[PDB]
Design a protein around this ligand. Structure first.
Ligand SMILES: CCCCCCCCCCCCCCCCCC(=O)OC[C@H](COP(=O)([O-])OCC(O)COP(=O)([O-])OC[C@@H](COC(=O)CCCCCCCCCCCCCCCCC)OC(=O)CCCCCCCCCCCCCCCCC)OC(=O)CCCCCCCCCCCCCCCCC
Ligand SMILES: CCCCCCCCCCCCCCCCCC(=O)OC[C@H](COP(=O)([O-])OCC(O)COP(=O)([O-])OC[C@@H](COC(=O)CCCCCCCCCCCCCCCCC)OC(=O)CCCCCCCCCCCCCCCCC)OC(=O)CCCCCCCCCCCCCCCCC
Ligand SMILES: CCCCCCCCCCCCCCCCCC(=O)OC[C@H](COP(=O)([O-])OCC[N+](C)(C)C)OC(=O)CCCCCCCCCCCCCCCCC
Ligand SMILES: CCCCCCCCCCCCO[C@@H]1O[C@H](CO)[C@@H](O[C@H]2O[C@H](CO)[C@@H](O)[C@H](O)[C@H]2O)[C@H](O)[C@H]1O
Lengths: 74, 52, 71, 65, 110, 71, 71, 71, 71, 71, 71
């Protein structure tokens, strides 16, 4: 069972950035497709920038967990 | 000012006029960070969003 | 207007726990700041790291709610 | 705030009592800074052979040096 | 042309609601003539900076057409941002009211 | 027959957790201000951040309730 | 249609959580006033600030309950 | 009606969140008074102010339960 | 295709139950950094280990939601 | 047999209390490592013992769930 | 025939409280150990004594569920 647990954890830590880049991207794409005016767009630019920072955070977290999970003593 | 018994204000103004006479030479100012970057980002997004 | 709406509504019950966790996070940041202000940028940093999980989880729940509202 | 900054409670208490004494009224403030002037002369040794000698008349420079 | 970044920053401050309260407080004991003269003086200071500094100084954007290209780019930016947006809205309006090309239709034959 | 109303009212119920989080956050703010009254702008700023997150989630859940009601 | 009562009552369930948050906030006030009885004013200020949002949430919950009731 | 009775019971469920808020507020008052008896009256006034908010929400919930019960 | 959706929505509760616990862990990290800023590392390691555990539980519940949602 | 999927979901909801427990445990561990750091070797050991229990409980909450999803 | 599985799941949906209690036990153990290491043997002795009840309760919380899965 430990192998299954470990592979589950590893794959989640590997796909976390892909999710942050893809599915939240699809949500932003929906909002872009639907919005027309200028006020909402002005306010939505900051959401996009927040998504940028959030993606870099998820990438840092994944780097940390992957260097933990791929570190061997010998 | 101390050498001619004048006012430091007047000497400052004279120096400034004489430096402006040769304005090709850049002058050294205190560094200040940029300002209003977030608002400028929003406006530039609005710009590209409507302009492109 | 059937069972999909009910499921997508029941999916939203986790947002309460997520909000409680966020409240705990930022209350700890507030207390640490009031105690030792001179490490604000550190506490804030760790808080953001925590949000990097909590926010993500909540968004997941919201997405799965919409997925069960339009499955 | 002091064990993190590498500072002692006695140093903090003295350096804050100084500011409090600065926030006094002149008739009592005169007697306060009077009774709380400073004059010391530290003399550091290392198996004889004095390394240094230095005077102190201020609390902050006394705690710093 | 110069200080485009400062102009963007000015617009951002103007759109900020905190600055609206700040301007409300600054408007105490103030006249419309004073405000108008201040704005006119600011614009004159900008154009005078140009007229003076172009004699001896060159910006990063200097080119064989000089400031003509910068002013053309300002115009083109304004056009694409404002006028083409208005054209888009007018197009959708006409298409909903008459159909595409409805404003150029011929008169009804008699 | 009225299942959309059920779904909306069940989705609304995260307001409880949202309000619990807000109360914990502002309680931390009040305590940290009673302790360190010279530090209120940083505490208020972090409280505003947390309140923004929590109100974002609350308006999300309210919007989803309205959606399930008027789909 | 009595069914639309249920939805409203369910939405009213959130009010319990809201009250919990209010309680926690006021407890933090009643403690802070004892911890630093010199001020007693900027804490009531932050209390009112938080109670604004919490009262808003309660008001919209009540309104949505009545809406799903009558409709 | 059965729907009316179920709706009333569901509304009754909200009660108890108010109880937790009331308990936390009173416990805070008891501790604050014990720690600083000097401010006993001020604590009572503050608690009374909180009492109005909690009492108003609790009665409002019971009123809604009765209204749903009798349509 | 409604019972599967309801089952997954009901399984999604552990996300909210886990966000509480992540909040407490990172709150403890914040408070420990406020009480001993000389030790930033040796607190984040334990924080990340416990967070990894709770993240694994989150993975479990989300995995089982998707499982019952498509099987 | 959708009720199988429901039973499984219900059997997994307890993870929300489990993870909370684990969080509290590690929170206390971090606090100890921030107060008396020189005895991490003790605190971590005790924490591991607690996890050796909690882990097991969680494994049960998985296993029984899958059993009710198949049998 | 899934009603038995549903009942077993419901009866198994109370181990979360046992887990929270155990977490509080070991959190207090770790805290009081960092406060006073020399008394560990008693803090542990009582912790184990508490487990001697909590684990037993959890055992019932499993056993009866298993029984309800078949009978
Ligand atoms: C008729 C129908 C239509 C009616 C509705 C019309 C719509 C109205 C909407 C209101 C907004 C209008 C547009 C302006 C937007 C703000 C733009 C701006 O200036 O920000 C630049 C701002 C400054 O950045 P910078 O220019 O680079 O640096 C300058 C310094 O910061 C220095 O800057 P500063 O010194 O000038 O100020 C700093 C300030 C910066 O904070 C801000 O960004 C300003 C935001 C305030 C918005 C208030 C709106 C008020 C109108 C609505 C009423 C709300 C009720 C509450 C009223 C106020 C009481 C609290 O604070 C801070 O930076 C942090 C310290 C906190 C200090 C305390 C600030 C609060 C002061 C007390 C309130 C004053 C009230 C003014 C009276 C208004 C009278 C009309 O930075 C930001 O961009 C902030 C983030 C952007 C905000 C959005 C965040 C993402 C969320 C987006 C929304 C979600 C998407 C949309 C979907 C939602 C569906 C519901
Ligand atoms: C997309 C372009 C087409 C626009 C839409 C179509 C319209 C066509 C009509 C074109 C008419 C143009 C208007 C002419 C009027 C004169 C304007 C002017 O000369 O001053 C501009 C103005 C500089 O004013 P300044 O008085 O000369 O002050 C200079 C400072 O002291 C700073 O001193 P410094 O020495 O440190 O730097 C001087 C200067 C030096 O500038 C340069 O020498 C050019 C930079 C590298 C050489 C190659 C340039 C071309 C390829 C790389 C750059 C791609 C962006 C294209 C920029 C167009 C201008 C070359 O630096 C800049 O101004 C930065 C410009 C590059 C911004 C890069 C932003 C990256 C985000 C965009 C994603 C990447 C590109 C996506 C693909 C787009 C393809 C079309 O630049 C600004 O926009 C201010 C930025 C303030 C920060 C705002 C927050 C960040 C947002 C960044 C976007 C900024 C808005 C522009 C959008 C472009 C990106 C989408
Ligand atoms: C132990 C090992 C640990 C391993 C850790 C692994 C975790 C990190 C994995 C993230 C990988 C994501 C990068 C690929 C996604 C971007 C695709 C792309 O480049 O688009 C074409 C880009 C965008 O071009 P464009 O958008 O202008 O136009 C063309 C776009 N296409 C072709 C897609 C239509 O090409 C570029 O011009 C890039 C130039 C800028 C540099 C971009 C790099 C910065 C952004 C990604 C950084 C991610 C790493 C973060 C590391 C943090 C660690 C501390
Ligand atoms: C390998 C797995 C992990 C990697 C993650 C990569 C997945 C990223 C893909 C986008 C995720 C969401 O994708 C979004 O939801 C589904 C995906 O079919 C689509 O939805 C569409 O198909 C579904 C079928 O299930 C229909 O019920 C729905 O009516 C229809 O709109 C949306 O058009 C899409 O925008």
């Amino acid at each position: 069972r430990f192998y299954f647990m470990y592979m589950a954890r590893t794959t989640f830590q590997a796909v976390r950035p892909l999710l942050a880049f893809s599915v939240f991207g699809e949500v932003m794409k929906l909002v872009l497709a639907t919005m027309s005016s200028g006020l909402f767009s002005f306010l939505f630019s900051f959401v996009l920038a927040f998504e940028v920072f959030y993606f870099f955070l998820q990438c840092y977290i994944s780097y940390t967990f992957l260097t933990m999970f791929f570190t061997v003593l010998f | 000012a101390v050498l001619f018994d004048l006012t430091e204000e007047d000497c400052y103004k004279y120096c400034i006029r004489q430096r402006a006479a040769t304005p090709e030479e850049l002058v050294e100012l205190k560094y200040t960070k940029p300002k209003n970057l977030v608002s400028s980002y929003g406006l530039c997004f609005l710009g590209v969003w409507f302009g492109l | 207007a059937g069972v999909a709406s009910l499921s997508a509504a029941i999916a939203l019950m986790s947002v309460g726990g997520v909000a409680q966790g966020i409240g705990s996070l930022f209350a700890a940041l507030v207390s640490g700041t009031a105690r030792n202000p001179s490490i604000k940028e550190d506490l804030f940093t760790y808080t953001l790291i925590g949000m990097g999980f909590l926010e993500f989880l909540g968004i997941i729940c919201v997405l799965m709610s919409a997925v069960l509202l339009y499955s | 705030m002091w064990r993190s900054s590498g500072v002692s409670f006695t140093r903090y208490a003295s350096e804050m009592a100084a500011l409090l004494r600065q926030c006094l009224k002149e008739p009592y403030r005169t007697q306060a800074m009077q009774r709380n002037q400073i004059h010391l002369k530290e003399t550091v040794y290392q198996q004889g052979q004095v390394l240094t000698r230095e005077t102190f008349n201020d609390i902050k420079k006394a705690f710093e040096a | 042309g110069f200080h485009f970044q400062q102009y963007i920053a000015m617009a951002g401050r103007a759109i900020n609601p905190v600055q609206w309260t700040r301007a409300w407080r600054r408007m105490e004991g103030k006249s419309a003539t004073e405000v108008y003269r201040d704005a006119l003086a600011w614009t004159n200071n900008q154009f005078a900076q140009i007229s003076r500094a172009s004699q001896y100084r060159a910006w990063w954007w200097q080119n064989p057409l000089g400031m003509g290209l910068v002013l053309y780019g300002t115009y083109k930016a304004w056009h694409m941002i404002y006028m083409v947006r208005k054209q888009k809205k007018t197009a959708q309006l006409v298409a909903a009211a008459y159909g595409q090309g409805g404003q150029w239709l011929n008169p009804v034959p008699r």
